[PDB]
């Protein structure tokens, strides 16, 4: 079984260089050409270069001619790439893949890795603010959890330390002014609370936080 | 570079349908299409290759056929586990190019969306901000608009919205719509609405709350 495994996610701010890698194995490494591509959410998937480990041939997309460097260690059985003066553009998840014919390639690509998550920013690492969300006064109740100002993602919410699965919807995170923000909401019957607890739980790994934030109805009169 | 397009970035199906995807390409790519297959995992597969051969290991109920600029990816017996993104690419010319992709969902029943909306706490008014969630989940279709009304007024700035793929689960949608603005803001209008269209309804289903109560 040919299979690629990238390396993990990487934050830089703009102005730095990093090196993301890729790891081959079930054939002969030397044998095939590596192939790297770019996936930004307004663009297609777009081409950056190419690198045969057998002599370390190599030929480049003219617009990442100076951007990105490829190299490959015929040892470790390892594609690299580099990417220098990071820039906003340069934000994307990066596939590395295998051309389609022994030795000399065909027209297609028939392996893939799983990605790699570049991120370009100067946002520094900032715990969530989490916020209840109680109703205003049916068989069901619907509550919320709102999730503000962290960075960088992800950002895991549970209900009720997971207790709570059915009924669940978590949204994907957004970007206002350098931090991300997502809400969570969980559909209960009208009968286990406001009777019951229901608490979402926040967790947020990068700045190793984790907090509860007990649903409870609103205080007015 | 040769441009490839697919007009398509959504398909609406059952289980055991006949589904085609379409390709197209800015020029003649002579039959040097290839297709693949990116399931929510996020994994890539190739299907076929050079407009209609089969990779190995991949199902028969997958075929491709097409020449000159149009193209397309058949599917016989849609199954489960054949909902994901299909996109193609042409390899005439360096460099490879890809279409957008055809994203498969599933047909069901429509479904009216079940609006809530909240007040922001007074814990997040500390901070200066004022946050104004609204969710709308589990409808189908997709097709959705929201307005935000404030005390009578339609409103834009500072409202950013949020969808969720189709669940496998039910086959619906949710969408989250939150209006940001400042505490000073928040603290001199009264009348909040969030209000949805959608074909489930002819009128729209309004959702609203008085700052002056609570
Ligand atoms: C990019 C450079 C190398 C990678 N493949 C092997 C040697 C070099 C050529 C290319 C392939 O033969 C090839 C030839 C001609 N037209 C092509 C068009 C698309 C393509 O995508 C995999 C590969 C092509």
């Known amino acids: 079984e040919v299979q690629l495994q990238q390396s993990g996610t990487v934050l830089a701010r703009p102005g730095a260089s990093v090196k993301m890698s890729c790891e081959a194995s079930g054939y002969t490494f030397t044998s095939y050409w590596m192939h790297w591509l770019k996936k930004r959410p307004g663009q297609g998937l777009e081409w950056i270069g190419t690198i045969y480990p057998g002599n370390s041939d190599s030929s480049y997309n003219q617009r990442f001619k100076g951007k990105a460097k490829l190299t490959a260690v015929t040892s470790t059985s390892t594609a690299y790439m580099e990417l220098s003066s990071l820039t906003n553009e340069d934000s994307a998840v990066y596939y590395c893949?295998?051309?389609?014919?022994?030795?000399?390639?065909?027209?297609?690509?028939?392996?893939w890795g799983q990605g790699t998550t570049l991120t370009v920013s100067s946002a520094k690492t900032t715990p969530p603010s989490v916020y209840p969300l109680a109703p205003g006064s049916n068989s069901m109740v619907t509550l919320g959890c709102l999730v503000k100002g962290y960075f960088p993602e992800p950002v895991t919410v549970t209900w009720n330390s997971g207790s709570l699965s059915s009924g669940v919807h978590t949204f994907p995170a957004v970007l206002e002014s350098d931090l991300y923000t997502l809400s969570s909401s969980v559909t209960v019957p009208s009968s286990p609370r406001p009777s019951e607890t229901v608490t979402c739980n926040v967790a947020h790994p990068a700045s190793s936080t984790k907090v509860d934030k007990k649903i409870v109805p609103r205080d007015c009169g | 570079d040769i441009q490839m397009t697919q007009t398509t970035s959504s398909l609406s199906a059952s289980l055991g349908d006949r589904v085609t995807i379409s390709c197209r390409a800015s020029?003649?790519?002579?039959?040097?299409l290839t297709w693949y297959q990116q399931k929510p995992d996020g994994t890539v597969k190739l299907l076929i290759y050079?407009?209609?051969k089969l990779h190995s290991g991949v199902p028969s109920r997958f075929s491709g056929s097409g020449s000159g600029t149009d193209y397309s990816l058949t599917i016989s017996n849609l199954e489960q586990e054949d909902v994901a993104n299909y996109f193609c690419?042409?390899?005439?010319?360096?460099?490879?190019?890809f279409g957008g992709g055809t994203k498969l969902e599933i047909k069901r029943a429509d479904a009216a969306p079940t609006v809530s909306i909240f007040p922001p706490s007074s814990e997040q008014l500390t901070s200066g901000g004022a946050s104004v969630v609204c969710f709308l989940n589990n409808f189908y279709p997709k097709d959705i608009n929201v307005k935000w009304k404030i005390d009578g007024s339609e409103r834009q700035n500072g409202v950013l919205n949020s969808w969720t793929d189709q669940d496998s689960k039910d086959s619906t949608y949710s969408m989250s719509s939150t209006l940001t603005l400042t505490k000073d803001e928040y603290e001199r209008h009264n009348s909040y609405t969030c209000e949805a269209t959608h074909k489930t309804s002819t009128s729209p289903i309004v959702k609203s709350f008085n700052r002056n109560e609570c």
């Open positions: 020029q003649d790519i002579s039959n040097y």
């Open positions: 690419q042409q390899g005439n010319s360096l460099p490879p190019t």
């Open positions: 050079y407009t209609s």
């Open positions: 893949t295998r051309e389609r014919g022994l030795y000399y390639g065909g027209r297609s690509f028939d392996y």
